[PDB]
């Protein structure tokens, strides 16, 4: 089911930023990944960020302009974007990948609308 509730999203004009929020009920566990990806309509999704639990962080202009980072305490990973650019358009999506079955957990997605 939704185990993963994103907020966050809205439209922003260009050169404004937006922070992303994804939080994870209590049924998620074991959880060695936490990604963020996107999918703008008639497109494929894309990846946009990653953490991988062992400390590691990556960000597939999304290098340097978005920023992945959690709050243990809170059971949140976040998606900072700065600069947005018309094209970032999309509907972006968390993700939580565990070592042990139901194995992936998508989030149900929030709007980023970049329109001046």
């Known amino acids: 089911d939704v185990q993963l509730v994103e907020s966050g999203g809205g439209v922003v004009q260009p050169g404004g930023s937006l922070r992303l929020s994804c939080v994870a009920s209590?049924?998620?566990?074991?959880?060695?990944?936490y990604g963020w990806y996107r999918q703008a309509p008639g497109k494929e999704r894309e990846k946009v960020a990653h953490?991988?639990?062992?400390?590691?962080?990556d960000y597939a202009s999304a290098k340097g302009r978005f920023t992945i980072s959690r709050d243990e305490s809170k059971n949140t990973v976040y998606l900072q974007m700065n600069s947005l650019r018309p094209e970032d358009t999309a509907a972006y999506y968390c993700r939580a990948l565990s070592r042990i079955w139901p194995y992936d957990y998508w989030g149900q997605g929030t709007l980023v609308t970049v329109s001046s």
């Open positions: 953490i991988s639990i062992g400390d590691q962080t």
């Open positions: 209590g049924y998620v566990h074991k959880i060695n990944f």
